[PDB]
């Protein structure tokens, strides 16, 4: 059975060259958009509604994520040559901001559900706790990001360049697989369920009314849900496929390994677009923000 032999890794130049351009462009767009949103929200103190605070926190999270992007792009280029301390700090910041962004999208969905379906009831008054809810979300993100800080370091290998991986000891692979449950449960499935429920009932109540602007609201809700799905679902599906392959549920082969690695990298590139796109989908699609930005040009 001499067929067995090491599966040598393969690297391409085209992906290296193009990924840097993509990351830089996304960095520029995200920085500009978040700066605009923060400026618009902070410049005027009138009309500081709950959604204003939610959008401010989302913009801050996206700004930090974009600020962290360039080091990650350099790492993708040449591997993590930047030591251990920076690996820990940057991984912490990236994961914290990602978790906070997702949970803030979920919170905005909850707020819209409370403000539309339950408009007439007495429960809606529970939407004036933006401060404590946002603090709780940030604290939960920091709590969830701990494993990255505790078990991350550079790993030196012969086949591959150094990477800012996790080092949990002899059984590190299994523990990494177990820790992957958190990003895919508190990061994809739970927020997805909450968003689907809230927006489904919002659509149900909107379709039955006779308001003038109902159709535009329905289209905006569809756009938000589809953007979230397109941005995140592919990466999560590929990660689940990788977990199953490591668990031997699906047959493992060198060609499959290369395909899944390429898919992981591509889906990470795609999902990075969320930081850049958020300012457009949530904030700039509103009349108030546009009017305020036009005013501030004075």
């Amino acid at each position: 059975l001499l067929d067995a032999a090491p599966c040598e890794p393969e690297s391409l130049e085209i992906n290296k060259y193009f990924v840097v351009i993509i990351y830089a462009l996304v960095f520029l767009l995200s920085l500009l958009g978040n700066s605009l949103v923060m400026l618009v929200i902070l410049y005027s103190r009138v009309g500081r509604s709950v959604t204003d605070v939610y959008l401010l926190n989302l913009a801050l999270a996206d700004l930090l994520f974009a600020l962290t992007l360039p080091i990650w792009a350099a790492s993708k280029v040449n591997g993590w040559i930047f030591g251990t301390f920076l690996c820990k700090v940057v991984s912490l910041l990236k994961e914290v901001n990602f978790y906070s962004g997702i949970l803030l999208l979920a919170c905005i969905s909850v707020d819209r559900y409370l403000a539309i379906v339950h408009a007439t009831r007495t429960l809606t008054q529970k939407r004036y706790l933006v401060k404590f809810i946002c603090l709780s979300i940030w604290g939960l993100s920091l709590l969830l990001a701990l494993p990255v800080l505790l078990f991350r370091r550079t790993v030196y290998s012969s086949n591959v360049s150094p990477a800012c991986y996790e080092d949990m000891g002899n059984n590190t692979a299994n523990w990494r697989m177990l820790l992957r449950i958190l990003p895919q449960s508190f990061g994809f499935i739970v927020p997805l369920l909450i968003m689907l429920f809230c927006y489904g009932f919002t659509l149900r109540t909107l379709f039955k009314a006779h308001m003038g602007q109902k159709h535009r609201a329905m289209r905006v809700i569809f756009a938000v849900v589809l953007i979230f799905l397109l941005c995140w679902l592919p990466y999560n599906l590929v990660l689940l496929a990788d977990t199953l392959m490591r668990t031997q549920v699906i047959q493992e082969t060198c060609e499959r390994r290369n395909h899944i690695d390429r898919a992981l990298d591509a889906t990470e590139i795609l999902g990075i677009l969320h930081s850049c796109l958020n300012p457009l989908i949530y904030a700039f699609i509103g009349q108030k923000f546009r009017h305020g930005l036009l005013k501030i040009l004075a």
Partner: protein
């Protein structure tokens, strides 16, 4: 040289019975973040690579004979 998002075991199957007359060098990696098992990879004189079972006493004998 190359960048990989995640690390995997360098071997899938486990072969035994390599002739030292063909082996050029041997590499041994303890179980670390890369993988959950000890891996022995032998590079032959013709450029081919092979994977050896750590539990095989023959593999240990070959390694010590190399040393």
């Amino acid at each position: 040289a190359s960048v990989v998002t995640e690390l995997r075991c360098q071997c899938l199957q486990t072969l035994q019975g390599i002739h030292l007359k063909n082996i050029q060098s041997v590499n041994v990696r303890s179980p670390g973040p890369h993988c959950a098992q000890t891996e022995v990879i032998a590079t032959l004189k013709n450029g081919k690579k092979a994977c050896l079972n750590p539990a095989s006493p023959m593999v240990q004998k070959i390694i010590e004979k190399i040393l």
